[PDB]
Enzyme design. Structure first.
Site, mmCIF file in Angstrom:
data_model
loop_
_atom_site.group_PDB
_atom_site.id
_atom_site.type_symbol
_atom_site.label_atom_id
_atom_site.label_comp_id
_atom_site.label_asym_id
_atom_site.label_seq_id
_atom_site.Cartn_x
_atom_site.Cartn_y
_atom_site.Cartn_z
ATOM 1 N N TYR A 84 0.847 -1.166 -0.003
ATOM 2 C CA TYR A 84 -0.146 -0.109 0.071
ATOM 3 C C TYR A 84 0.910 1.142 -0.025
ATOM 4 O O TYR A 84 1.999 1.210 0.506
ATOM 5 C CB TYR A 84 -1.095 0.164 1.374
ATOM 6 N N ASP A 92 25.689 7.965 -11.597
ATOM 7 C CA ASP A 92 24.574 7.275 -11.124
ATOM 8 C C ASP A 92 23.921 8.366 -10.328
ATOM 9 O O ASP A 92 24.269 8.642 -9.036
ATOM 10 C CB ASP A 92 25.201 6.042 -10.251
ATOM 11 N N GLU A 147 15.548 5.816 -4.790
ATOM 12 C CA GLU A 147 16.023 4.650 -5.398
ATOM 13 C C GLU A 147 17.030 3.954 -4.746
ATOM 14 O O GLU A 147 16.996 2.883 -4.356
ATOM 15 C CB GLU A 147 16.368 4.772 -6.911
ATOM 16 N N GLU A 201 2.516 1.030 -6.347
ATOM 17 C CA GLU A 201 1.596 0.681 -5.229
ATOM 18 C C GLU A 201 0.146 1.366 -5.376
ATOM 19 O O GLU A 201 -0.929 1.127 -5.199
ATOM 20 C CB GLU A 201 1.943 0.474 -3.876
ATOM 21 N N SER A 254 16.826 -7.385 -10.645
ATOM 22 C CA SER A 254 16.446 -6.331 -9.945
ATOM 23 C C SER A 254 17.669 -5.409 -9.485
ATOM 24 O O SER A 254 18.569 -5.399 -10.133
ATOM 25 C CB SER A 254 15.663 -6.722 -8.744
ATOM 26 N N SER A 278 8.989 -35.871 -12.974
ATOM 27 C CA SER A 278 8.805 -35.533 -13.996
ATOM 28 C C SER A 278 8.610 -33.794 -14.538
ATOM 29 O O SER A 278 7.897 -33.271 -13.835
ATOM 30 C CB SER A 278 7.611 -36.079 -14.797
ATOM 31 N N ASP A 318 -4.189 -5.904 -27.164
ATOM 32 C CA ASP A 318 -4.491 -6.288 -25.677
ATOM 33 C C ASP A 318 -3.645 -7.590 -25.534
ATOM 34 O O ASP A 318 -3.320 -7.865 -24.355
ATOM 35 C CB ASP A 318 -5.943 -6.254 -25.435
ATOM 36 N N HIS A 375 6.321 -12.966 -10.871
ATOM 37 C CA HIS A 375 6.540 -13.452 -12.254
ATOM 38 C C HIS A 375 7.040 -14.635 -12.307
ATOM 39 O O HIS A 375 8.048 -15.147 -11.259
ATOM 40 C CB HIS A 375 7.738 -12.662 -12.970
ATOM 41 N N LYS A 414 20.378 -10.087 -5.750
ATOM 42 C CA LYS A 414 19.437 -9.337 -6.360
ATOM 43 C C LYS A 414 19.466 -8.816 -7.697
ATOM 44 O O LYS A 414 18.619 -8.380 -8.570
ATOM 45 C CB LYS A 414 18.998 -8.141 -5.209
HETATM 46 N N1 LIG Z 1 20.548 0.583 -7.305
HETATM 47 C C1 LIG Z 1 20.848 0.535 -5.685
HETATM 48 C C2 LIG Z 1 19.515 0.292 -5.133
HETATM 49 C C3 LIG Z 1 19.293 -1.345 -5.115
HETATM 50 C C4 LIG Z 1 18.341 -1.662 -4.420
HETATM 51 O O1 LIG Z 1 17.853 -1.290 -3.249
HETATM 52 O O2 LIG Z 1 17.601 -2.963 -4.841
HETATM 53 C C5 LIG Z 1 21.892 -0.185 -5.503
HETATM 54 O O3 LIG Z 1 22.167 -1.092 -6.266
HETATM 55 O O4 LIG Z 1 22.601 0.030 -4.447
HETATM 56 CA CA LIG Z 2 4.296 0.954 0.341
HETATM 57 ZN ZN LIG Z 3 20.951 4.558 -9.996
HETATM 58 ZN ZN LIG Z 4 23.084 3.819 -7.299
#
Ligand SMILES: N[C@@H](CCC(=O)O)C(=O)O
Ligand SMILES: [Ca+2]
Ligand SMILES: [Zn+2]
Ligand SMILES: [Zn+2]
Ligand SMILES: *[C@@H]1O[C@H](CO)[C@@H](O[C@@H]2O[C@H](CO)[C@@H](O[C@@H]3O[C@H](CO)[C@@H](O)[C@H](O[C@H]4O[C@H](CO)[C@@H](O)[C@H](O)[C@@H]4O)[C@@H]3O)[C@H](O)[C@H]2NC(C)=O)[C@H](O)[C@H]1NC(C)=O
Ligand SMILES: *[C@@H]1O[C@H](CO)[C@@H](O[C@@H]2O[C@H](CO)[C@@H](O[C@@H]3O[C@H](CO)[C@@H](O)[C@H](O[C@H]4O[C@H](CO)[C@@H](O)[C@H](O)[C@@H]4O)[C@@H]3O)[C@H](O)[C@H]2NC(C)=O)[C@H](O)[C@H]1NC(C)=O
Ligand SMILES: *[C@@H]1O[C@H](CO)[C@@H](O[C@@H]2O[C@H](CO)[C@@H](O)[C@H](O)[C@H]2NC(C)=O)[C@H](O)[C@H]1NC(C)=O
Ligand SMILES: *[C@@H]1O[C@H](CO)[C@@H](O[C@@H]2O[C@H](CO)[C@@H](O)[C@H](O)[C@H]2NC(C)=O)[C@H](O)[C@H]1NC(C)=O
Ligand SMILES: *[C@@H]1O[C@H](CO)[C@@H](O[C@@H]2O[C@H](CO)[C@@H](O)[C@H](O)[C@H]2NC(C)=O)[C@H](O)[C@H]1NC(C)=O
Ligand SMILES: *[C@@H]1O[C@H](CO)[C@@H](O[C@@H]2O[C@H](CO)[C@@H](O)[C@H](O)[C@H]2NC(C)=O)[C@H](O)[C@H]1NC(C)=O
Ligand SMILES: *[C@@H]1O[C@H](CO)[C@@H](O)[C@H](O)[C@H]1NC(C)=O
Ligand SMILES: *[C@@H]1O[C@H](CO)[C@@H](O)[C@H](O)[C@H]1NC(C)=O
Ligand SMILES: *[C@@H]1O[C@H](CO)[C@@H](O)[C@H](O)[C@H]1NC(C)=O
Ligand SMILES: *[C@@H]1O[C@H](CO)[C@@H](O)[C@H](O)[C@H]1NC(C)=O
Ligand SMILES: *[C@@H]1O[C@H](CO)[C@@H](O)[C@H](O)[C@H]1NC(C)=O
Ligand SMILES: *[C@@H]1O[C@H](CO)[C@@H](O)[C@H](O)[C@H]1NC(C)=O
Ligand SMILES: N[C@@H](CCC(=O)O)C(=O)O
Ligand SMILES: [Ca+2]
Ligand SMILES: [Cl-]
Ligand SMILES: [Cl-]
Ligand SMILES: [Zn+2]
Ligand SMILES: [Zn+2]
Lengths: 679, 679
Positions: free
Chosen positions: B216, B325, B362, B374, B455, B559, B595, B618, B628
């Site tokens: 949320y 960055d 980020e 969200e 990610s 299997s 669609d 996914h 990650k």
């Molecule tokens: N891109 C940033 C944030 C990554 C994240 O929190 O998933 C890092 O790699 O530090």
């Molecule tokens: Ca949240």
């Molecule tokens: Zn970045």
């Molecule tokens: Zn960064």
């Protein structure tokens, strides 16, 4: 057009199909129900649908052991069985050579042979147990409840008994609930005889579907949970009986008197609560087994928007003959199909695709509809416009009963104004007029009552899980006495309920007409302002429930401001959206605004589900946690508030109330914003 | 048209914006980043977008205590602090009067002052700890790990250390990983000086977003978890240092030698594993606090399908100056916006709506993108066509790096054939040609490498949670040495990476052109056959991993037939669907088939999520549970198989492998069936 659709529907055809569907039993998982599936599939093809397929699944069902019958006993000091309950119901006149009438049983009871003292818990509602343990201080641990049927779904009773410590449950039909004054038992009237017994499952599935494959269709390669991790099984034995057998078990009851007159049925018995009077012994021997079921899915392709689905569905499986439940719904679906297929044969197609379903295993926990919807969820959620259910067409002959999402309130209002009332004393007058004189809304004004959707039927997965706008319609009384017994026959219907088949025909017009309009109207016949109105009412209601605890609301800072704020924005944005819906021409803008109307119900789904019920994802409606049949509004807040005075850690309990207010407010806001201009 | 779009993009403008975005720090939650948000919002308006709004959220961030600095000490027998680590990095030439350079810290470390003996764990990868505890039988309980940065996301290292019993973690940059041979430290080259330190968060959020409001948006009325139920916090203290400070801590190390040469960096040190050598003491004093963040959302309304969204997004917050960055990505987004807005001013509109985002926070766990998604999930899931990310445009200057869903493989292949290579020795030749000579696929044939999406950046919520087709593109090396340090400045970029700004310009063409095509092409430029090809490869791969346990596969009847069967049907149905896509005219059929293409990525989402990671939904791709940053294919099966020889109850472990095979097969089948004829 519509009038053509409606005029093609005939009462005689309905009668003819009902007769045809009710000569033998059609229990889920048996060969007879497979044969009826194959028949339905052939006929829907001859009737003209573009395709008709069987979808099958292997699901957990439950049957009595044919050679080791289930029964209940009174036993003396020496363990001799002095009273035995009936092994079967007396078959009705002329059906005594029908084989494979399944004896009365509670589907999914575990096996066991518990002995103990009786306790009588009235309807085994949550509040009945509250009266027992809180006021009367009677303790049900290691005891055996008997409970009468009525008021709430029998699964809830069994669950309540389990949590109260009980080791068995005996359910019975009391004549105060199942014997209407001044009419005769079957076969000479429509009342329950003392040998009649209500079958039905006692699962607490909470939307899961097949207990072994929650989330995923029970197909050929499905990985199944072991039976001990299965979803919704009772852990105590359960068995139902008629009121002749029940009088014998109740007459000796000792201990405390009934707390008041609402605990007293109408058997000539004291209705003492117990415990004790000699003991009671249950013999239950039923097995669970994985068994193939078959849904019939018919398709009538749309001419313009074939990727938009209007679904008319109801079940085909019956406990026994299914004269009312479900074949009176199924016979209506059959004629609706015939009638659509007749138009199709003359070159017509609906604008949207229509799917027609004959579901299997509804009686065993809505398994057929749910497995199919688990298999096709991606299609249903991006393309599903509406689901109209089609179980029993009649449960009485007094008036219309409609339960649906607010989005269909105006569609149903309009449709019933164009239909002739079939009622005595309203000839020439409209169905709308009879329905609203006979059943007026409490909630305002010169309008018929329409209820909230709970669950206990095949719409559940479509509405509560997937968020597809749903409705249902049937003729009702002012369940019914012969519900889920052997006495529910064609004869019951022709002789006592609907001799002319005109209530049937009216229900076929209401169901068929809803579907016609949903499938063919250019703009989807949903009014989002109707949702705005009930959201205010539901928010007033949940607020009043909370205001029974003013001190706690002060101490923990429990504000509803965010919810009322969301409901106001929904109201406002919903007005602006309906203005735009009137003022535009252009197949893209039309599709866009239809997609907005289609997805509005969808917007109320929270993918995390409600607390402890991951498969109930609608934030506005859920089945009551105390009665699967009843819808509750703002269920997450209502359950966080329920019986909150009894919780140990009030700040944690009130914390959870506030969290649920936040979820509901966010969801109402987000729903509204789907109706804002898109960019 | 497209060429007009591309020709309007200028390298000089990019340079100009980069300079403008990198003069002061823009840390999430500070006033400076709010001011840059307001600037971006003004300029995107002047550039021509239909609307530009700020969306703000109150999220958990983490800062060092300005008056009680964090540091590490060696302490003697009497508790005197004989070595102290640096309090700040030496600021680069000319920036010594910049205030509010946040000192090096590990965002979200809890507070503490643990003392203990060091253990050196190499990269603190899962297999490094396997080498420690399994082979060398070294036990990390109550010890303090040091670990070098590299290979895997630093959150994973901290998590691995926690599970191994460690009470603190010290991270450092080893020159073997962050000091490229033959180039000078900054400011005279692009290498990491011995005083340089890599900042970054150490959360294990698994897609949750703001640790206090999983599911949320963290809006004004949000109910927040208490910090002890917060998602993804470390429970041990963590701090990073440069390699000068690290040499001091490592030089005294005793105990076991390093198991082999891959544990040895290039500091003139033994790289002994410990434990012990005197003790180590951590002083960490950082607080967590709820702090407002601001996303900038620009809208360019589509002319024909305004209810279909193509999203170009990247972050704006930086650890310090953010020269690479993220401001090298942001400066590219800015010019893309300018350029779209120029066309718009001359009367043009794209066919679909384009959303442009400058995300906040980020660096602190993808919080800005996630909270917004969200809040708007219902819109994104019914209307979201594609998400293209726009973090750092360059991390090197050797070639193109593209990670994306298979659905965009052909779009990227085609687009890069129409673009001029900026490389030395490929003048006149196409970007496709340089990219594929420099970085060829292992997986087949005469084609460039394109990687899987994991990610660690803002695409996560769009792809892994919501199932919106996503991609990213940047220039790469053959992270980078100055990553997340004070030395990442404009000067770093102009002098050493991209003096002409031609790599920038190429990235702006690739990003901008992908978006243009997604937003304007009549039929969505997705090729579902590309998904069919990689699904076979992923199924071969997961199968081979399982076939390392032939006995177990026999014993438990494991299997893969159902998965290969689903992948074959997907291949077949995908061919038939592409035939139809070529052979049709009619705005309804077009919308329907678009669609179908739009929802295909969506079809891979399982609303129950992956085991223990509800926000990774996914079924085909997820971030590796051990890294990650890396995508893993069939993550549910891969994790059920990982290290399975070590599990106690093999039949339960193999049971779970089979369950995951079933989920993957069902999901591949169901995805395919979304591309079947609709009725
Ligand atoms: N891109 C940033 C944030 C990554 C994240 O929190 O998933 C890092 O790699 O530090
Ligand atoms: Ca949240
Ligand atoms: Zn970045
Ligand atoms: Zn960064
Ligand atoms: C129903 O619709 C309306 C939209 O018409 C929507 O109103 C919004 O309410 C929130 C407050 O609940 C507003 O938030 C403000 O945003 C501004 C920036 O534009 C901030 O500067 C303000 O923050 C200060 O004040 C707060 C409150 O005391 C402090 O806690 C905070 O720390 C700051 O000091 C303020 O947060 C929002 O701007 C409006 N939007 C409008 C009027 O357009 C409403 O929320 C919708 N209801 C629901 C439940 O969604
Ligand atoms: C990929 O696509 C194909 C469709 O081309 C699809 O094939 C299906 O496979 C299943 C079997 O895995 C078939 O199931 C059969 O259905 C018939 C009725 O039409 C039944 O009578 C059969 O049941 C008997 O045999 C079983 C197997 O031994 C017994 O276990 C069972 O108890 C019965 O005795 C059988 O179940 C299905 O009909 C086909 N559909 C076709 C060929 O059209 C395949 O499943 C798709 N792959 C995936 C993973 O979805
Ligand atoms: C219900 O109606 C159907 C068809 O109108 C009957 O099934 C047909 O029975 C006749 C005579 O045996 C056959 O010629 C056909 O093969 C059957 N059609 C099918 C299966 O589609 C059916 O017998 C009727 N049921 C009852 C009990 O009256
Ligand atoms: C039910 O019928 C009423 C009355 O026909 C409909 O409301 C009217 O619809 C027309 C057509 O768009 C509008 O121009 C009128 O202004 C509406 N009048 C009123 C009283 O609101 C209503 O739309 C119908 N509901 C349906 C079909 O969903
Ligand atoms: C980045 O560029 C912008 C605009 O091109 C500069 O902001 C403007 O600054 C001038 C001079 O102070 C003012 O007239 C405007 O009010 C500002 N515009 C805004 C906020 O939109 C900004 O100063 C540049 N930044 C730096 C550090 O050079
Ligand atoms: C990438 O370009 C290729 C070559 O132009 C495209 O594939 C052709 O597309 C046309 C237009 O529909 C078809 O008639 C041809 O038969 C296709 N040829 C081949 C070699 O497949 C491809 O569609 C483009 N991909 C995009 C734009 O997604
Ligand atoms: C029915 O009862 C008897 C006694 O246990 C036995 O023949 C058979 O196992 C039972 N059938 C079942 C459990 O399905
Ligand atoms: C009840 O049935 C059991 C088992 O068949 C039998 O032993 C007993 O006699 C029966 N009791 C009566 C009263 O018929
Ligand atoms: C149906 O018809 C009459 C009309 O009122 C009613 O009295 C009778 O009880 C009804 N039948 C049933 C089964 O309810
Ligand atoms: C910073 O450190 C000191 C000592 O505890 C104190 O003044 C202040 O509480 C700290 N600031 C925080 C915890 O934000
Ligand atoms: C480390 O810092 C502490 C606290 O400021 C101090 O007592 C100690 O002298 C320092 N050690 C060195 C070697 O400077
Ligand atoms: C960029 O340009 C040259 C060309 O090969 C290369 O040698 C140099 O190392 C590159 N710069 C960076 C920072 O990688
Ligand atoms: N309609 C059936 C099934 C209900 C359910 O399983 O939810 C009944 O009420 O017995
Ligand atoms: Ca299932
Ligand atoms: Cl119904
Ligand atoms: Cl990126
Ligand atoms: Zn029914
Ligand atoms: Zn029923």
């Amino acid at each position: 057009n519509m009038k053509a659709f409606l005029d093609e529907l005939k009462a005689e055809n309905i009668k003819k199909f009902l007769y045809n569907f009710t000569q033998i039993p059609h229990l889920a998982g048996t060969e007879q129900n497979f044969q009826l599936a194959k028949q339905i599939q052939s006929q829907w093809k001859e009737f003209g649908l573009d395709s008709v397929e069987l979808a099958h699944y292997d699901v957990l069902l439950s049957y009595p052991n044919k050679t080791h019958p289930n029964y209940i006993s009174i036993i003396n000091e020496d363990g001799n069985e002095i009273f035995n309950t009936s092994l079967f119901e007396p078959p009705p006149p002329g059906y005594e050579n029908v084989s494979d009438i399944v004896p009365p049983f509670s589907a999914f009871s575990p096996q066991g042979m518990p002995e103990g003292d009786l306790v009588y818990v009235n309807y085994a509602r949550t509040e009945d147990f509250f009266k027992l343990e809180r006021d009367m201080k009677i303790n049900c641990s290691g005891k055996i409840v008997i409970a009468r049927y009525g008021k709430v779904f029998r699964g809830n009773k069994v669950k309540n008994a389990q949590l109260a410590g009980a080791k068995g449950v005996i359910l019975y039909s009391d004549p105060a609930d199942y014997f209407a004054p001044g009419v005769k038992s079957y076969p000479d009237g429509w009342n329950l005889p003392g040998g009649g017994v209500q079958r039905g499952n006692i699962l607490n599935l909470n939307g899961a579907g097949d207990p072994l494959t929650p989330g995923y269709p029970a197909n050929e390669y499905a990985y199944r949970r072991g039976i001990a991790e299965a979803v919704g099984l009772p852990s105590i034995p359960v068995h139902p009986i008629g009121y002749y057998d029940a009088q014998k078990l109740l007459e000796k009851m000792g201990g405390s008197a009934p707390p008041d007159s609402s605990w007293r049925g109408s058997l000539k018995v004291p209705y003492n609560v117990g415990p004790g009077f000699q003991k009671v012994k249950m013999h239950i021997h039923s097995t669970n087994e994985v068994t193939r079921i078959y849904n019939v899915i018919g398709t009538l392709r749309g001419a313009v928007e074939p990727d938009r689905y209007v679904i008319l569905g109801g079940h085909r499986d019956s406990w026994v003959f299914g004269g009312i439940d479900p074949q009176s719904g199924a016979a209506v679906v059959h004629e609706i199909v015939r009638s659509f297929g007749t138009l199709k044969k003359e070159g017509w197609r609906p604008r949207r695709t229509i799917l027609f379903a004959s579901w299997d295993a509804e009686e065993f926990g809505l398994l057929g509809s749910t497995e199919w919807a688990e298999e096709n969820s991606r299609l249903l959620q991006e393309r599903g416009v509406a689901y109209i259910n089609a179980d029993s067409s009649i449960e009485g002959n007094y008036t219309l009963r409609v339960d649906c999402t607010p989005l269909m309130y105006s569609l149903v209002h309009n449709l019933t104004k164009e239909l002739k009332s079939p009622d005595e004393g309203f000839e020439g007058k409209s169905l709308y007029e009879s329905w609203t004189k006979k059943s007026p809304s409490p909630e305002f004004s010169g309008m018929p009552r329409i209820s909230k959707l709970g669950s206990g039927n095949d719409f559940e997965v479509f509405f509560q899980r997937l968020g597809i706008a749903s409705g249902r319609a049937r003729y009702t009384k002012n369940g019914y006495p012969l519900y889920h017994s052997v006495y529910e026959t064609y004869e019951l219907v022709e002789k006592f309920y609907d001799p002319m088949f005109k209530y049937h025909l009216t229900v076929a017009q209401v169901r068929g007409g809803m579907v016609f309009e949903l499938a063919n109207s250019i703009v989807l016949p949903f009014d989002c302002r109707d949702y705005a109105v009930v959201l205010r009412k539901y928010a007033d209601k949940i607020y009043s429930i909370s205001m029974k605890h003013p001190q706690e609301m002060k101490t923990y800072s429990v504000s509803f401001d965010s919810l009322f704020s969301a409901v106001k924005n929904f109201t406002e944005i919903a007005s602006k959206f309906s203005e735009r819906l009137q003022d535009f021409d252009n197949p893209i803008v039309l599709r866009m605004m239809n997609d907005q109307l289609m997805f509005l119900e969808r917007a109320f789904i929270d993918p995390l589900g409600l607390p402890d019920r991951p498969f109930y994802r609608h934030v506005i409606y859920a089945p009551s946690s105390h009665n699967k049949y009843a819808g509750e509004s703002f269920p997450g807040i209502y359950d966080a508030l329920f019986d909150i005075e009894s919780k140990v850690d009030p700040s944690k309990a009130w914390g959870e109330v506030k969290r649920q207010i936040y979820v509901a407010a966010f969801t109402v806001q987000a729903a509204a914003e789907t109706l804002s201009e898109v960019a």
